[PDB]
Design an enzyme around this catalytic site. Structure first.
Site, PDB file in Angstrom:
ATOM      1  N   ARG B  49       0.828  -1.197   0.000  1.00  0.00           N
ATOM      2  CA  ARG B  49       0.000   0.000   0.000  1.00  0.00           C
ATOM      3  C   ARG B  49       0.871   1.258   0.000  1.00  0.00           C
ATOM      4  NH1 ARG B  49      -2.677  -2.878   4.038  1.00  0.00           N
ATOM      5  NH2 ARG B  49      -2.183  -1.187   5.514  1.00  0.00           N
ATOM      6  N   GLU B 178     -19.624  14.120  -0.928  1.00  0.00           N
ATOM      7  CA  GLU B 178     -19.754  13.075  -1.927  1.00  0.00           C
ATOM      8  C   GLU B 178     -21.023  12.298  -1.710  1.00  0.00           C
ATOM      9  OE1 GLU B 178     -16.551  10.181  -2.086  1.00  0.00           O
ATOM     10  OE2 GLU B 178     -17.466   9.144  -3.738  1.00  0.00           O
ATOM     11  N   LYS B 220     -18.702  16.158  -5.117  1.00  0.00           N
ATOM     12  CA  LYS B 220     -18.241  14.979  -5.846  1.00  0.00           C
ATOM     13  C   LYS B 220     -19.447  14.121  -6.128  1.00  0.00           C
ATOM     14  CE  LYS B 220     -15.034  10.986  -5.570  1.00  0.00           C
ATOM     15  NZ  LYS B 220     -13.973  10.370  -4.805  1.00  0.00           N
TER      16      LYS B 220
HETATM   17  C1  LIG Z   1     -13.342   9.120  -5.121  1.00  0.00           C
HETATM   18  C2  LIG Z   1     -13.049   8.344  -3.864  1.00  0.00           C
HETATM   19  O1  LIG Z   1     -12.525   9.010  -2.944  1.00  0.00           O
HETATM   20  C3  LIG Z   1     -14.060   8.363  -6.230  1.00  0.00           C
HETATM   21  O2  LIG Z   1     -13.487   7.104  -6.480  1.00  0.00           O
HETATM   22  P1  LIG Z   1     -13.915   6.266  -7.817  1.00  0.00           P
HETATM   23  O3  LIG Z   1     -13.425   7.177  -8.905  1.00  0.00           O
HETATM   24  O4  LIG Z   1     -15.412   6.052  -7.821  1.00  0.00           O
HETATM   25  O5  LIG Z   1     -13.143   4.964  -7.623  1.00  0.00           O
END
Ligand SMILES: *[C@@H](C=O)COP(=O)(O)O
Ligand SMILES: *[C@@H](C=O)COP(=O)(O)O
Lengths: 337, 337
Positions: B49, B178, B220
């Site tokens: 990671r 989001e 988002k």
């Molecule tokens: C943003 C996550 O923090 C969106 O991720 P994705 O593009 O849906 O994998």
């Protein structure tokens, strides 16, 4: 409610406000106009109401400044002294004709109001009386006291406005939704600002839940100020700052225009606040214009006084006040044309 | 939460999206990244990671296309193989550093979810761990079934998002909210469109009720499409039309930008939908950009496969995919730079 149908609504909303134009509100019920008449010694006859609207609508050159006029239902049945239907005075001038469609207010909870008339609204929109109308108006009114407007009353009024808006659009009329914040109250400018953000954001929620065509809706709004019973002062710049912040925070890019109501503010103050908001910086897509009854027609009433000899001067004041409003609508009131 | 304080938030929101830039989302929890790793035969060690994020953040030239990166909390404690804190890789590139601050989801009603973590959010925002962060992210997720999302779940999630947003701003962080519409479901594109209008209008209500500084919030959002289990087809133009209509209907001029999530759509589809929305006509004030995890990093994972020998090529794919996203963010993907 097909694509061309939706485009016509957006075209109408834009035509009303093109070139710095605004709306002359002339839609007072016989009772509301009557009270205005009686203060100035004018008898509330149907004839004087008819004559008053003739005086307004027949003013030469008014169409340079006025893109639409909101009529009372009774005025659609009326003619000029010379025989011409009053609506024909406006049509010939290229001015859009509107119809106020609410049936007034009734009590709601403790000390609040909701607006009424949805039950036969669809039928009324189809009346042959309003065949020449291309837009409509519906007013709700929000009283301010401790703990009021209540959330129930915000929701119910926004629901009613949104239901009216969708019915209008289905009948090919552009709806003006008027969530008026009542000036007669004791509240601070901070509180007006915060509650205006609640009301306008909630209104946008209900318009969206009713799937209203957002480019075909006009919003008629109060300026953000303290209440008439508050001892709090403000200036045009502060009204402009707070009002524009509230609108930038709440009104989607898709809305074509906001038209301010004068609301019991003076003609001079209402026009000065409009000018100040249009001088503010801050990117936006919608026009900031006017939908004035009192701010445009109080001077006409005060000059006319029911005496035919005063009509020419009364029309001059309408034209001059309309000019100032229009200059304010583009932020140019300080500047010489 | 003074005027200069508010202006700094707006400046940060704009810097993230200037010049067609977008956001690289790298904020996957160990469990979420782990699942991605295990499909491709890569062991879910902390070391892998750490290395994966180093591979992303050390890619040369990425700052031309990426204005901000969303980090997982664990990555703030991590260094490169060469000893340099991973955040320093981004700071040196002038890329804004974000922190994902939700603690995931818990069950709500029947079959729905709410996001959690508000109770210590203020304390966490002040962590010295996140001293270099200038923005944050918080995800809610809306599942679709018959009669779902329910109104309760829309309201509760919008409430939580708005509460998180105001706490962020009070700590000098720009919040990304989001409200993701989950792609894994069986619903039509009409239904997605209508519910997106409910969710986004309700989100704007709660942000306004919490008196969030609207120019310092990023949204988002999911593209408007049918669900993965629907047999309904759509094209990029239709996604663009419906998505932009929903946004024009709901998002106030004051919001600085919308950043689309890839959401389980392909990298190519997600970038193609972005390009198509940016070719659409229709006046608006906000940027339409990207906040992608999968659409930007799936190729990197598939090229790298845990083998150091593949890293140079993996970084090349990140850079090339970031270029395409950025071109899409300005509607120029068909055009040669
Ligand atoms: C943003 C996550 O923090 C969106 O991720 P994705 O593009 O849906 O994998
Ligand atoms: C519009 C009424 O239809 C607003 O009237 P006002 O300007 O407040 O008298």
């Amino acid at each position: 409610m097909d694509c061309d149908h939706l485009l016509r609504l957006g075209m109408t909303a834009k035509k009303i406000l093109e070139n710095g134009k605004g709306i002359l509100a002339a839609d007072e019920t016989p009772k509301t106009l009557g009270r205005r008449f009686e203060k100035l010694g004018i008898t509330n006859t149907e004839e004087n109401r008819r004559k008053f609207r003739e005086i307004l609508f027949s003013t030469k050159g008014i169409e340079r400044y006025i893109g639409g006029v909101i009529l009372n239902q009774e005025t659609f049945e009326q003619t000029s002294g010379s025989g011409v239907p009053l609506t024909e005075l406006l049509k010939k001038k290229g001015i859009e004709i509107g119809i106020k469609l609410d049936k007034g207010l009734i009590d709601y909870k403790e000390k609040e109001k909701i607006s009424v008339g949805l039950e036969d609204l669809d039928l009324r929109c189809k009346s042959s009386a309003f065949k020449d109308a291309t837009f409509a108006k519906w007013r709700s009114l929000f009283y301010f006291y401790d703990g009021i407007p209540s959330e129930d009353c915000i929701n119910e009024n926004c629901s009613i406005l949104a239901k009216y808006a969708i019915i209008c659009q289905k009948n090919g009329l552009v709806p003006i939704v008027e969530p008026e914040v009542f000036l007669e109250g004791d509240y601070s400018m901070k509180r007006s600002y915060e509650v205006t953000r609640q009301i306008l954001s909630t209104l946008m929620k209900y318009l969206n839940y009713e799937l209203v065509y957002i480019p075909g809706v006009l919003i008629k709004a109060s300026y953000v100020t303290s209440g008439q019973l508050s001892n709090e002062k403000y200036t045009p710049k502060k009204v402009a700052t707070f009002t524009l912040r509230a609108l930038l925070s709440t009104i989607p890019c898709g809305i074509p225009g906001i038209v301010f109501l004068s609301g019991g503010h003076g003609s001079e103050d209402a026009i000065g606040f409009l000018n100040a908001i249009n001088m503010e910086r801050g990117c936006r897509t919608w026009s900031l214009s006017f939908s004035f009854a009192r701010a445009l027609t109080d001077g006409v009433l005060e000059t006319w006084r029911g005496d035919d000899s005063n009509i020419e001067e009364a029309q001059k004041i309408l034209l001059e006040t309309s000019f100032k409003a229009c200059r304010g609508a583009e932020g140019k009131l300080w500047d010489q044309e």
